Design a protein around this motif. Structure first.
Motif, mmCIF file in Angstrom:
data_model
loop_
_atom_site.group_PDB
_atom_site.id
_atom_site.type_symbol
_atom_site.label_atom_id
_atom_site.label_comp_id
_atom_site.label_asym_id
_atom_site.label_seq_id
_atom_site.Cartn_x
_atom_site.Cartn_y
_atom_site.Cartn_z
ATOM 1 N N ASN A 122 0.859 -1.188 0.000
ATOM 2 C CA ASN A 122 0.000 0.000 0.000
ATOM 3 C C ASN A 122 0.890 1.231 0.000
ATOM 4 O O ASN A 122 1.538 1.530 1.000
ATOM 5 N N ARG A 123 0.912 1.962 -1.109
ATOM 6 C CA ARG A 123 1.777 3.132 -1.140
ATOM 7 C C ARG A 123 1.054 4.395 -0.700
ATOM 8 O O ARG A 123 1.697 5.343 -0.243
ATOM 9 N N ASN A 124 -0.261 4.450 -0.858
ATOM 10 C CA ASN A 124 -1.001 5.636 -0.449
ATOM 11 C C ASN A 124 -1.341 5.560 1.033
ATOM 12 O O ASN A 124 -2.064 4.663 1.467
ATOM 13 N N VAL A 125 -0.802 6.485 1.822
ATOM 14 C CA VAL A 125 -1.040 6.492 3.260
ATOM 15 C C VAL A 125 -1.308 7.913 3.733
ATOM 16 O O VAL A 125 -0.417 8.763 3.705
ATOM 17 N N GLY A 126 -2.536 8.174 4.158
ATOM 18 C CA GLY A 126 -2.856 9.412 4.832
ATOM 19 C C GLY A 126 -2.673 10.678 4.029
ATOM 20 O O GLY A 126 -2.257 10.651 2.870
ATOM 21 N N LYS A 127 -2.991 11.801 4.657
ATOM 22 C CA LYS A 127 -2.829 13.111 4.058
ATOM 23 C C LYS A 127 -2.247 14.018 5.121
ATOM 24 O O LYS A 127 -2.388 13.737 6.309
ATOM 25 N N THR A 128 -1.593 15.090 4.704
ATOM 26 C CA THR A 128 -1.097 16.079 5.647
ATOM 27 C C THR A 128 -1.496 17.479 5.201
ATOM 28 O O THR A 128 -2.074 17.681 4.132
ATOM 29 N N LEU A 129 -1.172 18.457 6.041
ATOM 30 C CA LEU A 129 -1.629 19.830 5.880
ATOM 31 C C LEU A 129 -0.431 20.734 5.660
ATOM 32 O O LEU A 129 0.607 20.561 6.304
ATOM 33 N N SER A 143 -10.404 5.758 2.233
ATOM 34 C CA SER A 143 -11.788 6.192 2.389
ATOM 35 C C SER A 143 -11.897 7.264 3.471
ATOM 36 O O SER A 143 -12.580 8.271 3.291
ATOM 37 N N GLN A 144 -11.225 7.033 4.596
ATOM 38 C CA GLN A 144 -11.172 8.006 5.673
ATOM 39 C C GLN A 144 -9.862 8.780 5.615
ATOM 40 O O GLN A 144 -9.078 8.664 4.672
ATOM 41 N N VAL A 145 -9.626 9.591 6.637
ATOM 42 C CA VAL A 145 -8.330 10.209 6.862
ATOM 43 C C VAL A 145 -7.987 10.060 8.330
ATOM 44 O O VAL A 145 -8.882 10.021 9.185
ATOM 45 N N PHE A 146 -6.693 9.988 8.620
ATOM 46 C CA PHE A 146 -6.187 9.688 9.947
ATOM 47 C C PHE A 146 -5.443 10.875 10.523
ATOM 48 O O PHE A 146 -4.671 11.538 9.830
ATOM 49 N N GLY A 147 -5.694 11.135 11.797
ATOM 50 C CA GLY A 147 -4.859 12.012 12.576
ATOM 51 C C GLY A 147 -4.155 11.189 13.635
ATOM 52 O O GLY A 147 -4.286 9.968 13.682
ATOM 53 N N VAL A 148 -3.402 11.875 14.479
ATOM 54 C CA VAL A 148 -2.727 11.251 15.602
ATOM 55 C C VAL A 148 -3.078 12.045 16.844
ATOM 56 O O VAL A 148 -2.748 13.229 16.945
ATOM 57 N N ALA A 149 -3.754 11.408 17.777
ATOM 58 C CA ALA A 149 -4.216 12.058 18.990
ATOM 59 C C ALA A 149 -3.175 11.782 20.047
ATOM 60 O O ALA A 149 -2.993 10.642 20.464
ATOM 61 N N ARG A 150 -2.473 12.816 20.459
ATOM 62 C CA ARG A 150 -1.426 12.696 21.447
ATOM 63 C C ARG A 150 -1.993 13.116 22.786
ATOM 64 O O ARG A 150 -2.387 14.270 22.964
ATOM 65 N N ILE A 151 -2.062 12.176 23.709
ATOM 66 C CA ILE A 151 -2.799 12.358 24.947
ATOM 67 C C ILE A 151 -1.778 12.435 26.063
ATOM 68 O O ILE A 151 -1.323 11.409 26.569
ATOM 69 N N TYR A 152 -1.413 13.640 26.460
ATOM 70 C CA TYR A 152 -0.386 13.812 27.478
ATOM 71 C C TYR A 152 -1.094 13.881 28.814
ATOM 72 O O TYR A 152 -1.688 14.899 29.154
ATOM 73 N N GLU A 168 -14.923 18.903 12.576
ATOM 74 C CA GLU A 168 -14.831 20.126 11.778
ATOM 75 C C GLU A 168 -13.898 19.915 10.607
ATOM 76 O O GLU A 168 -14.303 19.963 9.441
ATOM 77 N N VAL A 169 -12.626 19.674 10.921
ATOM 78 C CA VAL A 169 -11.591 19.679 9.894
ATOM 79 C C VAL A 169 -11.806 18.564 8.892
ATOM 80 O O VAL A 169 -11.391 18.680 7.735
ATOM 81 N N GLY A 170 -12.443 17.476 9.298
ATOM 82 C CA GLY A 170 -12.757 16.439 8.337
ATOM 83 C C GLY A 170 -11.950 15.172 8.510
ATOM 84 O O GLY A 170 -11.871 14.350 7.596
ATOM 85 N N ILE A 171 -11.345 15.000 9.680
ATOM 86 C CA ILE A 171 -10.580 13.798 9.974
ATOM 87 C C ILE A 171 -11.449 12.847 10.773
ATOM 88 O O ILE A 171 -11.987 13.211 11.817
#
Lengths: 240, 127, 181, 130, 283
Positions: free
Chosen positions: A39-46, B1-10, B63-66
């Motif tokens: 899988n080469r497509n992974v996520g998106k960034t800003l 299909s979705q998009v992923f963030g990373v939730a950093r929980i300090y 909001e942002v769409g993640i």
RNA sequence: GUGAAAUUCUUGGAUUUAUUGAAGACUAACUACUGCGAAAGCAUUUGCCAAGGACGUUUUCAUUAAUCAAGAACGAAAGUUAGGGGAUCGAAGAUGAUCAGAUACCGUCGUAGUCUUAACCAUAAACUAUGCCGACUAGGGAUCGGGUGGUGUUUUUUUAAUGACCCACUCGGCACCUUACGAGAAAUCAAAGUCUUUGGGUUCUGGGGGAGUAUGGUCGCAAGGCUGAAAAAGGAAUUGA
RNA sequence: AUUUGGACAAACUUGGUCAUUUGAGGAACUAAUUCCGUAGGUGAACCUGCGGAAGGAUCAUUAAA
């Protein structure tokens, strides 16, 4: 605290009005991994903006994402490894990325380290044929025979030193004969540690042999052609 | 299909941050904080506080769409303690409840190989 | 919309998991509607929620927490309580986290926490309505938030060295106050 | 009181159920038992030291009847109460008044000065007696 | 608290206090009041300060009715933040935590009292009586010994207290030097602090510390500024040029290689005079 | 940040996040009733320099030995002198809060120290609360180092190693579990034993608590040498007469 | 820059002036854990730094599939 009795400090003198609308001013880019993985497509960034293509290109030349080979490859059994990719060439919303490092997960390390055996950590610094100075950490644990009765399986300092020497020479021979793309291709399906086992099988029976970590240290002169080949040109639409 | 963030929980020992970021941790999306949702300072590190914090950040992320997040929980690490607390547990539960798709949980707590001295002094720190 | 989770089990906590397993999956499947599995070829328990059968989104996380507590070494019925409610947490720390103790001192400190025949630990648990488990050196506390805070407080005093007599006196005082409130 | 240094027989689930749900039921149990056995004792001693036959006092769910009832079974408690104890009269609520026992209500302002003084001296000697 | 349980030691305190019938006596820590009644009997005026209303009330109800009530006065509240009128004699049975500020407030008190009979810890009193060249010698010892003459009276065991504490005590007699010697408190304090930063080192090294030379640099710089002259340019640090200045003064004094624990008042004051001449002022 | 707060730092974006960089310590989990050393003490990797115990030995000298005042070597932490570096914690100190309760007496900053070289200091519950050398007197397993043998798995095969485990035996260790036909007042002790009252060699040492007292038994440590005041119901009181 | 003469003249003094605010008597009215070595200490009925000791109270889990 946002309480009434939380007395004002020098603090709340002059604020700034929330009018910027940052995630309206910002923009979405999608990244792609090298051709070794599946899988080469992974996520998106800003990216902060595009008014400065300086800003866009610079942010995405600094970026470094960090994924897990399970997500990358589809097999859930690489859950504990976790690689770091850094994007360095960008084109048309779409980022091209190459290998940058490896690690396990802290859960897996704590899981492997148990109490009645010896740990062996080998540490070699080398450079590939691609001129990528690299550092590899390997670990192994002295397991026990099928008819053990002794509670522990400890190795002597002599056996430890012999195994460290063997691991060092295997790692350095492998990753000096290799190239970095070839290095990741070897490092994916756990083959260096199969070699380490198959070589140390006569000194002392080991278990959990793993290439714990890989570290980039120096990089060569950049090569956009090499990147594009590694990933395996365009016109516009006549705006008037 | 979705998009992923990373939730950093300090989950500090007397506060809690829930900081959502994009992959590569560069572009922070939303950051809230214990006392910031709870106007006191006994309760700035309370499970209720973290619950509200995570609810609001789930709002901002949607909001942002993640839609999905990996999560990296964390304790203060260092010479201090090294295991995420009730604050982090509460935040995690609240968010997974809130219905962002949780992908992969990790505990990235900085564990010193060989720490310097710790604040207590020879007699011991607490009490 | 199936959603998954994985949690590993150490070996010394892997025998009792098999032993009391038959009392473990019924609460997971009947009241939470949560498909379970145990990869005994990776020593993990995998909980996945079905798109249609489950109802509560948080059921998955409560299940993961319940199994996690059982793994850390709590009794089955205690961990079931962690399922039943929604406001039970687990806090851990270590004797070297409180004060650097070396060898025989550390052993004596764990002895002072446990008390003869566990009398001390049982006193604390009964007093503050929590469950304490000493691992080798890690100590874990399950209970409501303020309750585990109080339990930690007493335990840390014990670690520094207040004799169990004085600690027990403090426990009975706070117990009377909590009972009156 | 005293704590329990033995292992608790009921886990958190159960103790929270208990907190979810006459001083001490054990206290009433012991009270009832001692009362019964003391009745037994006084029976024995009255048999020994009386002159005339005395019977064993007694023997010792679902809706129950009450065969004894210390009211004529047609008298309402509204009719067994007496007017004093359902309403006496007491000091008036407003600071502007004083209300004696015999049902007069006074207004501090519409009293004349001498009336003020005499009511005063009365209250003073009452408070002095008390 | 802790209650006194020896009328014989109360007699002793009064006797060695040696009250004159024309005096006014400031009493701290009356307790049950036996000392209060004895001092009202002996002296002319008595003022007793207390912070605890319970013992205050019990004392005043214990004294009410007697003819000495017209002369006794009681002052309530904390007395470190209030005005204390002149008193010829001082007597103190206070808990020690305030007792150290009691000593220094009494010494700083304008028109200081003739004598003060105080109770102190055994260790604290050994500190106040610490003569130079003795291990206990401290900056506190130096200050008190050169603003007043102190002398032991008696030692009180822990067993003579209800309930007994565990630090043995003593009673001491403090006599303020009247008039006070003409030296600046702040400058003398700065000197003692710098030299006693570590009592058993060499004063040369004590100056060789960093922040001491920084503060001395700032002080000498503002001194030369208000005197309206400039210094010669230093190749390195102004701290270092004043450091060599201090080196010069230390060598000409020949005190740089002496123990702060063995220097007497005279050496300290001569060193301060040398600094005052060379232009150094610690305050 | 605490039990609770508070100085403090924060639009010139702190706490947090990502990528790096420097600086000095430190060497986690693996860490055990395991190892090494004369004790104090000693845990990352590789190299060099010497040193050491044990074991193996059909090698060698042939009494060279044991106990021992003086003296010497080394001697944790703190400490001293002079240099160096100075991230972290941190006696003194400076400060915040002094809120009941201390059941829950701390927070911010920090000199000296901590680290290092060259010298001093030479003390610790430096403990296995017990001088050393030799010999004999009970059973049992485990464990670390060495050697011998046996047997099958793990291993591998004209290249460079031929190690792991299991079993019996074996010297030598760190300790342990059972008991003493012994000893002891007892706890306990494999030495604290060595058949009723006593001789294997050798060095040092001995003839309770608080109190009350006498001090020529003795050592320390003090002051001032112009300076002074004269009885009340002539009450209490929103409660009284 | 400097200089003449006026009126204004701030401000001060000595007051005068009226104005407004604010000490004990008289006289009315109304209202009612223990310890060791060393180092240091000034909010010291004792505390602190560093290295040690027990002469200080051990419950639960635990070979392997």
């Amino acid at each position: 605290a946002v309480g009434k009795n939380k007395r004002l400090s020098k603090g709340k003198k002059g604020q700034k009005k929330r009018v910027v609308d940052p995630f309206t001013r910002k923009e979405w880019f999608d990244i792609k991994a090298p051709s070794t993985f599946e899988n080469r497509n992974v996520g998106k960034t800003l990216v902060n903006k595009s008014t400065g293509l300086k800003s866009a290109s610079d942010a995405l030349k600094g970026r470094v994402v960090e994924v897990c080979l399970a997500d990358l490859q589809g097999s859930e059994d690489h859950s504990f490894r976790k690689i770091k990719l850094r994007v360095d060439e960008v084109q048309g919303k779409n980022l091209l990325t190459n290998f940058h490092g490896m690690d396990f997960t802290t859960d897996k390390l704590r899981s492997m380290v148990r109490k009645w055996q010896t740990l062996i950590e080998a540490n070699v610094t080398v450079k590939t044929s691609d001129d990528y100075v690299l550092r590899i950490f390997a670990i192994a644990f002295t397991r026990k025979q099928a008819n053990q009765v002794k509670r522990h399986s400890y190795a002597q300092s002599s056996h430890i030193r012999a195994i460290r020497k063997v691991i060092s020479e295997i790692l350095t021979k492998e990753v000096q004969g290799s190239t970095l793309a070839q290095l990741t291709s070897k490092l994916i399906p756990e083959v260096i540690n199969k070699e380490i086992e198959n070589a140390t099988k006569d000194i002392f029976p080991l278990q959990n042999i793993h290439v714990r970590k890989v570290k980039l240290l120096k990089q060569p002169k950049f090569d956009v052609g090499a990147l594009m080949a590694l990933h395996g040109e365009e016109k516009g639409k006549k705006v008037t | 299909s979705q998009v992923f963030g990373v939730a950093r929980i300090y989950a500090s020992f007397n506060d809690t941050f829930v900081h959502v970021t994009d992959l590569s941790g560069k572009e922070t999306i939303a950051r809230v904080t214990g006392g910031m949702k709870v106007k006191a300072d006994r309760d700035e590190s309370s499970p209720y506080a973290a619950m509200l914090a995570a609810q609001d950040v789930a709002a901002k992320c949607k909001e942002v769409g993640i839609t999905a997040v990996h999560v990296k929980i964390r304790a203060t690490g260092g010479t201090r303690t090294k295991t995420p607390g009730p604050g982090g547990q509460a935040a995690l539960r609240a968010l997974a409840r809130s219905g962002l798709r949780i992908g992969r949980i990790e505990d990235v707590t900085p564990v010193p190989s060989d720490s310097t001295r710790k604040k207590g002094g020879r007699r011991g720190r607490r009490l | 919309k199936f959603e998954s989770r994985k949690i590993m089990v150490p070996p010394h906590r892997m025998t009792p998991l098999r032993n009391s397993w038959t009392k473990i999956y019924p609460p997971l499947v009947e009241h939470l509607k949560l498909q379970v599995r145990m990869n005994l070829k990776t020593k993990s328990v995998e909980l996945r929620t079905n798109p249609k059968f489950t109802t509560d989104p948080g059921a998955l996380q409560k299940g993961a927490d319940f199994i996690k507590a059982f793994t850390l070494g709590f009794d089955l019925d205690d961990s079931i309580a962690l399922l039943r409610l929604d406001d039970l947490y687990i806090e851990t720390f270590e004797v070297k986290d409180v004060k650097t103790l070396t060898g025989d001192h550390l052993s004596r400190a764990i002895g002072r926490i446990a008390g003869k025949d566990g009398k001390t630990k049982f006193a604390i648990e009964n007093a503050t309505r929590t469950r304490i488990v000493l691992a080798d050196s890690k100590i874990h506390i399950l209970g409501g938030f303020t309750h585990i805070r109080m339990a930690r407080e007493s335990v840390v005093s014990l670690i520094l060295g207040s004799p169990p007599g004085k600690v027990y006196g403090n426990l009975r005082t706070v117990a009377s106050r909590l009972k009156e409130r | 009181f005293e704590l329990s240094d033995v292992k608790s027989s009921k886990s958190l689930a159960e103790i929270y159920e208990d907190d979810y749900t006459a001083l001490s039921e054990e206290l009433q149990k012991a009270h009832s038992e001692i009362s019964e056995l003391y009745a037994n004792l006084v029976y024995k001693l009255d048999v020994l030291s009386s002159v005339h036959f005395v019977p064993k006092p007694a023997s010792t769910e679902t809706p129950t009847i009450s065969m004894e009832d210390a009211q004529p079974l047609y008298m309402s408690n509204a009719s067994s109460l007496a007017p004093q104890e359902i309403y006496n009269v007491g000091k008036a609520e407003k600071d502007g008044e004083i209300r004696l026992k015999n049902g007069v209500a006074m207004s501090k302002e519409e009293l004349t000065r001498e009336d003020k003084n005499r009511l005063r001296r009365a209250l003073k000697r009452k408070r002095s007696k008390a | 608290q802790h209650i006194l349980k020896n009328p014989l030691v109360a007699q002793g305190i009064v006797d060695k206090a040696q009250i004159r019938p024309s005096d006014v006596v400031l009493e701290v820590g009356p307790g049950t009041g036996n000392l209060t009644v004895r001092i009202l009997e002996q002296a002319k005026n008595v003022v007793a300060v207390e912070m605890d209303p319970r013992m205050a009330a019990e004392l005043t109800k214990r004294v009410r009715g007697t003819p000495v009530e017209k002369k006794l006065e009681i002052m309530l509240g904390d007395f470190m933040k209030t005005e204390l009128p002149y008193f010829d004699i001082c007597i103190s049975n206070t808990p020690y935590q305030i007792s150290s500020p009691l000593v220094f407030k009494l010494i700083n008190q304008p028109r200081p009292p003739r004598v003060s009979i105080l109770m102190f810890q055994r260790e604290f009193a050994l500190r106040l009586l610490a003569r130079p060249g003795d291990s206990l010698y401290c900056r506190l010892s130096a200050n008190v010994q050169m603003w007043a003459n102190v002398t032991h009276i008696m030692k009180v065991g822990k067993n003579n207290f209800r309930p007994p504490p565990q630090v043995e005590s003593s009673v001491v007699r403090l006599e303020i030097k009247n008039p006070r010697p003409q030296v600046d408190y702040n400058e003398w304090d700065g000197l003692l602090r710098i030299v006693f930063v570590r009592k058993n080192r060499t004063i040369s090294a004590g100056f060789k510390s960093t922040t001491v030379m920084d503060i001395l640099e700032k002080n000498y710089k503002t001194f030369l500024a208000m005197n309206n002259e400039m210094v010669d340019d230093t190749k390195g640090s102004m701290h270092d040029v004043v450091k060599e200045k201090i080196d010069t003064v230390l060598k000409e004094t020949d005190l740089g290689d002496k123990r702060a624990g063995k220097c007497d008042q005279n050496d300290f004051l001569r060193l301060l005079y040398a600094f005052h001449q060379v232009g150094i002022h610690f305050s």
